[PDB]
Amino acid sequence: RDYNLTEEQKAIKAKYPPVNRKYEYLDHTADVQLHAWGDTLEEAFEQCAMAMFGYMTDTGTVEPLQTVEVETQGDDLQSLLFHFLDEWLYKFSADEFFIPREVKVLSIDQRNFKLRSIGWGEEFSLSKHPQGTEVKAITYSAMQVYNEENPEVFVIIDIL
């Protein structure tokens, strides 16, 4: 690590004997837990995607200029949530660096674990959109999906 120093701080370093250093820092990792909810399971999932993007920027500044569709499937609801968010992340990450202003989950097939969703927004841009934090990956850790009245989900994402 190197820090930005004031001259006074520099003066202090110069004034005392140097410290021999034999260490290094490895594998810095960071995450945050998203907690989303709604009146339906669909809404809980869509709100979780919007939480993820809401970490990257103020999605209120994102103009609803294009629409992108994300459909996916899973072996159970956790798996489905995982793949849903992953596919949305990938849309942002690769190809068009698309950021939705909003996401709407049109359906979740609760018997076969399929989902259809759509989001509207535009290509992300440092001049247009405020800088939040980049999201690196979705994880299964402490993933919970509560499919009950006023459904909720808890997901942990790896951030930079």
Next chain:
Amino acid sequence: DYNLTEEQKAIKAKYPPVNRKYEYLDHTADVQLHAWGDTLEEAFEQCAMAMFGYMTDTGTVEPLQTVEVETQGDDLQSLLFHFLDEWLYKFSADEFFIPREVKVLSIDQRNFKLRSIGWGEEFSLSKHPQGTEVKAITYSAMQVYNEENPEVFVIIDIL
């Protein structure tokens, strides 16, 4: 939340607002310290120094006073754990002491106890650059290698 420009605030008020039903909880972070030395004592002191080095530039810490940390454990791993933990406590509790340097006087490898000292001063953002706060020591993937080239790996929780 975000600090917006005038253009960005227009865009925001131009469109229907988004109804949000989510919150962010439990942000966590960690980093793995890797330190080494001529001796196990050096490797241990270096590990403590690495921890403090993540909080600030320790070259900017003046050596105005000296503090002792003696501890004990049930093995080398718990010894290292307690050592870093007591040093973190010194910083985090009572006077906010940060050492510029730490020296491990001895490690008893038979009975797992050690004596160490550090020299420095009270930490202030008036004087010292801002690094990252250290929250706790963990045992995750803790490694102590004690052959030629003693070295240790310790994960700490941060921010």
